[PDB]
Amino acid sequence: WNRKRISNCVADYSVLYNLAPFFTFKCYGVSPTKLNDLCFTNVYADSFV
Amino acid sequence: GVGHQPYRVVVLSFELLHAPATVCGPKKSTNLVKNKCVNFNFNGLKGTGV
Numbered sequence: 459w460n461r462k463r464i465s466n467c468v469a470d471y472s473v474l475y476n477l478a479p480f481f482t483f484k485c486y487g488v489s490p491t492k493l494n495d496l497c498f499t500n501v502y503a504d505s506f507v
Numbered sequence: 508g509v510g511h512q513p514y515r516v517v518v519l520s521f522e523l524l525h526a527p528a529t530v531c532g533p534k535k536s537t538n539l540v541k542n543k544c545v546n547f548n549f550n551g552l553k554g555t556g557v
C-alpha cells in the first residue's frame with residue numbers, strides 16, 4: 459500500500475465531498491465536522507483497493 | 508454513485524409531555540380505582556401508589 463506524506467499545506471476537508479460519492483467516512487478520536495478547526499504536524503494518506 | 512443519489516427524508520419532531528397530550532399511542536384506557544394501592548399509567552406517566 460502507498461503512503462503519501464501531507465505537510466506544509468492548508469487542508470479543507472469539505473473539498474473531499476466533491477471528490478467522491480462516499481460510501482464510508484468514519485473517524486476515530488476526532489469528530490469529522492471539527493477537522494477544519496484543528497492543526498496537525500503531519501498527515502499520512504494510505505491508498506488501496 | 509451512492510453518495511449522490513437523492514434521498515427523501517422525513518423528520519418527526521416530538522414535543523414531550525408537559526401539557527395535555529393531543530397525540531397518544533394505540534392504547535386502551537381502563538376504569539379508575541381510588542383509595543387503594545394500584546399501578547397507574549396517566550398519559551405515559553407510570554407509577555405505583557394510592
Ligand SMILES: *[C@@H]1O[C@H](CO)[C@@H](O)[C@H](O)[C@H]1NC(C)=O
Nearest residue numbers: 472473474475476477478479
Ligand atoms: C479528476 O481529474 C480529471 C482529470 O484529471 C478531471 O476531469 C475531474 O474533474 C477530476 N475530478 C474531480 C472530482 O475533481
